[model samples]
Target: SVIEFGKMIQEETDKNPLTSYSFYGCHCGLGNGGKPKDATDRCCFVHSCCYASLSDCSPATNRYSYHKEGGAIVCGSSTPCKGQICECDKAAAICFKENLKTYNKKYKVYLRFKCKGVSEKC
Candidate 1:
């Protein structure tokens, strides 16, 4: 089946409880130290894109477990997903919830990444 790209993008901009995710490092360079080259120069990568989403990340087990758009894993053998964490953006990211206490906010889902296992992290 052919997915409507425009509709999907519209839907993602508002509704949809969860989406897919990939993982990547902020350091654009794929070498040691803080000399990042570019976004495409990321190492320790597991997929074509390199940033995991909330719908795919598992902090407990530390792995990518998101369902693909066509009902299959988004990654192939060489690009298999690995452990990662996600940090939703309130400005660019969207949030959808049925419960109150922020149920009608648009793109208000911001995620703060930090060391977990500590109660303060959640």
Candidate 2:
């Protein structure tokens, strides 16, 4: 069962978090390019979860950045979906930072044959 949470999260957070059958961590450059390999991989996995929460936006389309101002992304009502996307990315950034020890670049091979067939637009 899924528990309703107040704020966004990364890592093994929010208990039973949301998941998609699509790209998942493929965008994060990990694995046979499919299953999440480690903490770094899980960061992107859950980040993708945040995007799938609402159909209003995408995880890839509206690229976010800390350059907006003071390392903060101010999402207004104009693009309501940016609100969660920014938070999700922020958390994933921190997750990656904290788990830098287990980050294995070896799995980052350019062989995404398994994930290539997955829907990128999902």
Candidate 3:
């Protein structure tokens, strides 16, 4: 089923939580140096989204781990990450938690490219 889209929300915590939510567009460009390139010149990447319960969220591994190198900046294949599994909102590029209220603490979320190693030099 298609995941519903709505207002982008965010929250924070006193302790630096390991798990967090983030958004990103399709990464399509070349890296100037060793770093990734800009993610603006691209389209929506539908495969870079995931969802899971609060208890399941972890930092050691992430569903969208391809971009962990330095944030997405290019489109890449998505592998099975730990979680219950859910659809991602292409427009928002954000993941939806199974139960937002399960966790008492809040965390910060942001927008970014859904891919990694985008910067390869044009």
TM-score of each: 0.20, 0.50, 0.17
**Any runs in candidate 2 off by more than 4 Å, and if so which?**
1-34, 63-79, 110-122
Give a tens-digit lDDT track for model 1, residues 3-118: 22112223444443233211112221121222212222122122112333333543224333333365222322232223232212211222211122333232122122421222
lDDT of 2 at 64: 40
lDDT winner, 1 or 2: 2
lDDT tens digits, residue span 1-122, model 3: 12111212121112221233322222211111223222222212222222222225441233431221243222233543322221232222332232233322221322233334534322
Distance from true location, Cα of 96 in model 1, Å: 27
lDDT of 2 by residue, 1-122 (tens): 01211122223233222332122345552233355556766776775666678546755566443322453434343445655666665566556556767655454442355555444332
lDDT for residue 48 in candidate 2, whole number 0-100? 60
Residue 6 accuracy (lDDT) in model 3: 23
Q: For each candidate in the order shown, give its overall lDDT on alpha carbons.
A: 0.25, 0.47, 0.26
Error of 1 at 58 (Å): 8.6
Which ranges of candidate 3 are over 4 A from the true structure?
Answer: 1-50, 53-78, 82-122
**Which window of ten consecutive residues has the lowest lDDT sum in model 1?**
89-98
